Design a protein around this ligand. Sequence first.
Ligand SMILES: Nc1ncnc2c1ncn2[C@@H]1O[C@H](COP(=O)(O)OP(=O)(O)O)[C@@H](O)[C@H]1O
Ligand SMILES: Nc1ncnc2c1ncn2[C@@H]1O[C@H](COP(=O)(O)OP(=O)(O)O)[C@@H](O)[C@H]1O
Ligand SMILES: Nc1ncnc2c1ncn2[C@@H]1O[C@H](COP(=O)(O)OP(=O)(O)O)[C@@H](O)[C@H]1O
Ligand SMILES: Nc1ncnc2c1ncn2[C@@H]1O[C@H](COP(=O)(O)OP(=O)(O)O)[C@@H](O)[C@H]1O
Ligand SMILES: Nc1ncnc2c1ncn2[C@@H]1O[C@H](COP(=O)(O)OP(=O)(O)O)[C@@H](O)[C@H]1O
Ligand SMILES: [Mg+2]
Ligand SMILES: [Mg+2]
Ligand SMILES: [Mg+2]
Lengths: 95, 45, 257, 259, 255, 255, 253, 235
Amino acid sequence: ELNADSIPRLKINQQYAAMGNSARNDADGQFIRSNLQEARWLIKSLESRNDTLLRVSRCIVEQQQAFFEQGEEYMKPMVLADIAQAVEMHESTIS
Amino acid sequence: MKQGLQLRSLAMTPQLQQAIRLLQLSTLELQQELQQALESNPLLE
Amino acid sequence: AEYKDNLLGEANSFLEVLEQVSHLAPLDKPVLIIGERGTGKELIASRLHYLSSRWQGPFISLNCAALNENLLDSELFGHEAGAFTGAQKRHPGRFERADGGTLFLDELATAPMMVQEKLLRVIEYGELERVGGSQPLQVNVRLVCATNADLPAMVNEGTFRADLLDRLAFDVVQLPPLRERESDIMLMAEYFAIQMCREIKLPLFPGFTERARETLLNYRWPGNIRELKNVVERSVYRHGTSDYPLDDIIIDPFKRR
Amino acid sequence: MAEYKDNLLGEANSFLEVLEQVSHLAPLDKPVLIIGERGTGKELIASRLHYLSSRWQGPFISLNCAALNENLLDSELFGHEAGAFTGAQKRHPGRFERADGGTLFLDELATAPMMVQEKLLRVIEYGELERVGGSQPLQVNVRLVCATNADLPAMVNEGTFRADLLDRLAFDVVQLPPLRERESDIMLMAEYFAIQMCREIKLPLFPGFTERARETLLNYRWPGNIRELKNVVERSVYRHGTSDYPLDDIIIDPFKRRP
Amino acid sequence: KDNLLGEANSFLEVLEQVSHLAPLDKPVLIIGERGTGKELIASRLHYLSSRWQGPFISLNCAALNENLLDSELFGHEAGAFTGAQKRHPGRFERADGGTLFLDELATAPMMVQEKLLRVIEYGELERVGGSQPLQVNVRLVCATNADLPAMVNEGTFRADLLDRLAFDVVQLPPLRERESDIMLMAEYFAIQMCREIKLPLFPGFTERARETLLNYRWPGNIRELKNVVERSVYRHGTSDYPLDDIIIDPFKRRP
Amino acid sequence: KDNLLGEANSFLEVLEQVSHLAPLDKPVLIIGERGTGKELIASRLHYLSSRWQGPFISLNCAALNENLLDSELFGHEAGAFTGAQKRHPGRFERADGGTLFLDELATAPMMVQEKLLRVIEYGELERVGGSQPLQVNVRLVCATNADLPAMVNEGTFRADLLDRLAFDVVQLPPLRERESDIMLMAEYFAIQMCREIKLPLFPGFTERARETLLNYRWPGNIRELKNVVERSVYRHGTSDYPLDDIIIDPFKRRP
Amino acid sequence: DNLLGEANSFLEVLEQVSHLAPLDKPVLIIGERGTGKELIASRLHYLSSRWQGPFISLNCAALNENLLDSELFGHEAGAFTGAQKRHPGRFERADGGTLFLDELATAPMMVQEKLLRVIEYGELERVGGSQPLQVNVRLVCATNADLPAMVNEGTFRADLLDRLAFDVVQLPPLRERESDIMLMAEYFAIQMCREIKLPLFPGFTERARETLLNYRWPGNIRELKNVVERSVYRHGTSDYPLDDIIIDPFKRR
Amino acid sequence: EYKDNLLGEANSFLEVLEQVSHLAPLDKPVLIIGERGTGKELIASRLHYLSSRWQGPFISLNCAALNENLLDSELFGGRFERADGGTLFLDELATAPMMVQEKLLRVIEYGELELQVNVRLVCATNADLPAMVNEGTFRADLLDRLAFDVVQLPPLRERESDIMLMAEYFAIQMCREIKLPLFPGFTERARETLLNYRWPGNIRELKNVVERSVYRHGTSDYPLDDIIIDPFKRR
Ligand SMILES: Nc1ncnc2c1ncn2[C@@H]1O[C@H](COP(=O)(O)OP(=O)(O)O)[C@@H](O)[C@H]1O
Ligand SMILES: Nc1ncnc2c1ncn2[C@@H]1O[C@H](COP(=O)(O)OP(=O)(O)O)[C@@H](O)[C@H]1O
Ligand SMILES: Nc1ncnc2c1ncn2[C@@H]1O[C@H](COP(=O)(O)OP(=O)(O)O)[C@@H](O)[C@H]1O
Ligand SMILES: Nc1ncnc2c1ncn2[C@@H]1O[C@H](COP(=O)(O)OP(=O)(O)O)[C@@H](O)[C@H]1O
Ligand SMILES: Nc1ncnc2c1ncn2[C@@H]1O[C@H](COP(=O)(O)OP(=O)(O)O)[C@@H](O)[C@H]1O
Ligand SMILES: [Mg+2]
Ligand SMILES: [Mg+2]
Ligand SMILES: [Mg+2]
């Protein structure tokens, strides 16, 4: 289970989102739209990091359940390319 | 099978690349970076 | 270690074959078979893979028939990048599938002779023949086969070159015919009755009449196991059949009205 | 220099002399061709020459002739990539192009298309480079190796093999001593494979050889020279038995149904 | 632009034909067996042509990719389903008055034949998705191992090719026909060989077997001549290695 | 108008037929031996035809690769096709308002005919991703040395379509059948080569060479005429001695 | 609304054709070799409710690549932006009117399989445009020289053809009627003479026509057209009546 | 319910209907045997109409065949998404691409790349699948996993007695649509012709023949004795 409390949440200021379309000034709207695009890119980046982490973690916990259960003595040879092939994990974003 | 015509995308670099590079960082590394970034944006919470 | 699943192999020769397999299990060489039809051979191949109990997956399972274009089984030794059109990254596959493993050769006789030559060329030295410019790469994995095809016959035909044919000569298995096996057949018949009663979780195994088993014996039974599995569900298809024993076994799917 | 033959499964009869001739022929890089039967040491001879790939930098290039399927085989000759085919990728040069200077081991399949062999022969005769495009051929030397597995001048008469390709090929042949010919270390290499088999089995000790078994070994038609001998060796080894009996039954024909 | 002249009066007349043709850019054929060296003579014409500083480089007819035949003489400009690049023209487009010896013409596709039949048309180079064709003068030359009339009776090449046949295809004399400097050719070839053989000289030498070789099939004028020369030399490799009992039979079972 | 080789009565009849046909924008075809050079007549006609100025098309048949007319004739100037996109020049698109001589359409895929049929009959086509087909004002022309009379009889043409491809074909006589302008063609060739070889003067041919032409069955006619010209060029020898032995069968090996 | 030949049986067939013409049920249109009676459908569509409705026609021989998005439903979504730059697919172009097909007997029968579905209410959904269709755009097809024995020959799906039409479209033999022969003959002669800017029609020999009346009519109306043109050019003179009939430009002298 | 269209008075049609009704309650995948056009998917229509999950969107709709990357986008979005929860169709099963067929079968249970939605898949085929397996044109594993319980259809030759009723029904519907005053009447010649009418197709054949026949008849006053049939051809 992903540490959702340790997972930050990116919130967009909806008051600014409602205070830009009414802006009869184009510069304010353009700056707001650029800020929104950047913030959306950042939030999507964090979310993609979290989701890829969760998928690869499921793959590893499946691989390292013996390492999880019996322990480091029963720690199987685990590699990223093998894990990526096994769980269809990212080929380079994961790396 | 053979060769003729047919067949047919791309990713992004720099800005998308910087956003992706931010994620390879540590957890609290991402948290402090998020705090510093949110220090600027007037349209985020 | 890991235990192979139960198989109704009550034939005394079948037990002997199992024993031969058992001796071969520590060994690691080619494993061929007479490929009896309707007869569950690669199940035994799995019992082998299971007998090896190798870490990771060495029990590859792919035939030849779907490799209709030569390219498909050609891509059992896949493509790396950009040979023809790269529809996806690292078209390689099915080769590392038994990375440290073994290969199950099904529908092997249908394979192209050029394809066969490529396979054999892979056999000994192990070189990775990846389509597209690159360097080869071996891997410590094995292979095994099972086919109704008559190897001496094909040698007369020369369908595959003789070099490969001998290169495969390391373990043979002539599965008994479906018409050959009778007592094990009824044994597995009751076994499948029970197994269906379990998997469907129907309240009652109906049973079968003595006439039911006898008539099933009078059935063509072309596949001792494959036909039996279809017959199992064919009787399981009937509704209320589980409550009382019935001899209603659906041979022909096209049979109607 | 000289590298130890990782295998010297050789015949004192004349494969000693054959190996000697090979060693004499080895230093140059001129046309290199051999000859032999189904499974008759010919890969092993390939290894012989690859060790005879003199000095260092012996780039072993294998030309599995009956491979390459149908279509892109043409590229496998010359070189793919650029934007040429249904794809685009970096310059994966043809297999001959991929190896510059390397050892060109011919698989003695005898390609069905004479023109395809001729196209390889034209590149084989010389390389002028493909500055126009990677679709073409380039400026590469290579050591080259051929062998025979069938009747050459017959096919010349049979029209199976082009005379011009044949004339360039076989500048100096290398025939092989068949199982029906070599027959030299039969018992010797026999026990050689036996010891290899015991060590593989981690076996206790060699039970021995039966006089009946040795008589059969002499009587063997040996349809395959090198491997089929080793094949039956493995056959008996797997057949195995008590250490009490040196050898039991015949492993020459495993195909035969088990008693 | 020369080699180990076969030193023949026929060779003299053939060279005369070449020299007479030298300025001309007319398309040219040849029917030469392996070891003829007609290709070498052809390229000798190419360098010695009026376009001495001309771009003269062949391309085996057998070469072309199954579908790239248009991409063979012409070269990719735009589209073509590549989706990128494909802006490079053809080596034949790269010719422009230069030479590309049409070797291997004995086997090109009838499809290839007709596409070239278009190339036989004066100028007008069309590329994929093109705007305006290119009338690009280029010097044409070819050689074959077989008989053009033989193919014609077979209909093997379309008579369009016979139209494409333009300059009088000089032909190399047969080995039995050539028979010009066999000892001398052996001498030069063996000089080169001993250079490669790195042995000092042929102390054996001798010439009775030279006349015996005068009684030889010699299927390749240079393909077999020097081939057998080296075969025998390497089997010898000794200083005192004479023309006696040296055989050309690499396929044959020696003792 | 244009340099026309020949003044035969049948040739004159053909010329008058061209004069009559000139208004007929209706497409038709011409039947001639390879090397006929009828295309030249077609071009002279088209210039003299209603397109006193228009487009002009050569259009080698064997010139397309699994690529439609919107990749062959129409062009994909309307881009947005599969794969990348751009502005793509188109032949039948470019041709509209001009001269469209189809080249040796005998060798043509059944698919090619499949497209061209509707391309011609209505004269409206559409392209790579277009709304409307419009129509072309070009002149639809063609010829092939084959006798389609057997081709579509073999089925090798859609005889319905090929007939619809034709309005009233014209076929030039054979020169061997014509058998007349031998002297004039010879003289023109002599002067032309004397210029080309930069020669001083034409030696002339003995009446023996005239009779050789009289026997020169000449399977190439104008093609064979130029072939004989080539023969003379190699047989240049001396201008003082008149050309004695002209007939050069290059397929016959000399000596 | 056009110029063409007519016969009593031809008139009856045209009458039945008009009777079907307002009706929206598609029928199978089979024509003589030298018929190209597509104009009949053109009248029918005018005689159909599509008198002001759509009238898109395409010949099923002219494709592009293994599959054409424009053939049924496509746009500029190959990769990258994925934009319905021209969502308008074939039926989207032809919606609500005449969807006329030519070159029918001559495409990949897989396309026929594909056609069968679009034939049944389209429901074509492209990346450019997704729509359930079932839009009653007038369906009709032509180039019907083929035979149901081609299904016996296995040319295409007999089921596709069987579901294709519920009613017929015939074509009386041109060699059969030969009634308006001189009539349409003079008609085409005048049309060309105007096109030829010719002075006038000099007439023709009745013997010439009667000899010309001997013909298998292999090219039917097309044969008539080409024959008239050739005979006119051979006449090349409006002075004397055209006593000559150009039997075949496949000829020599 | 849904209008007694093709209400098969052949008691065999009723029995097929009863089996289908039992399967209608079942949410397990299912298929039916018949010929298309010889009654293309009419039972599929009934099953969607007899949808117990009546609000369940039986979008279904799988007779045809799409493109390659089209199968890519459909399986990995339409497919289960196209008919979420609801009923899943399949026809021209002989027309599937091998990659496409593998994708479908894997979705039915599970795949091997390194799940699905909805319930009650429904299918039918127009050709003898066992011969195709003998030809080896698909995965027999898919064949079995599909072959839990089927719904055959009566042949047109088998569909014999109720044929007069079906013809009359088609006549009623047609005259309603055709604006004809009335079905002009049954004639012995027409009935005998229909008896001879082999009608390789069942529904499409009879319907198209009747359409041609009525269009020919055009007289609600005048019954048609022996109207011939052809929906195409020249003269
Ligand atoms: N012990 C078993 N348990 C479950 N299934 C079995 C067993 N033995 C055989 N089968 C089934 O029989 C089918 C065909 O068996 P087999 O005859 O070995 O195939 P082949 O026809 O290739 O020889 C297989 O699909 C397999 O599922
Ligand atoms: N001393 C040896 N060392 C290794 N392999 C040997 C030896 N002697 C025989 N063999 C085996 O015998 C065979 C030699 O024949 P090979 O070259 O493979 O056949 P072919 O001539 O058809 O190419 C191989 O299987 C090889 O492994
Ligand atoms: N005059 C010459 N001097 C030296 N070598 C020659 C001469 N003519 C031909 N050769 C040899 O012939 C070989 C080329 O073969 P070639 O005769 O061109 O085959 P083909 O005529 O069938 O194309 C070259 O290796 C070259 O050494
Ligand atoms: N009317 C003509 N007068 C003189 N020479 C002609 C004439 N027509 C063609 N030729 C000659 O014949 C050849 C033309 O061949 P080509 O145009 O390829 O004929 P084809 O119609 O068969 O394509 C050239 O050598 C040309 O000089
Ligand atoms: N009854 C008729 N009388 C005269 N011309 C006709 C008649 N019916 C059709 N035509 C015309 O005859 C021509 C037939 O040739 P074409 O259009 O190529 O036929 P198709 O479309 O069958 O290939 C067309 O112009 C067509 O409109
Ligand atoms: Mg099997
Ligand atoms: Mg050569
Ligand atoms: Mg037409």
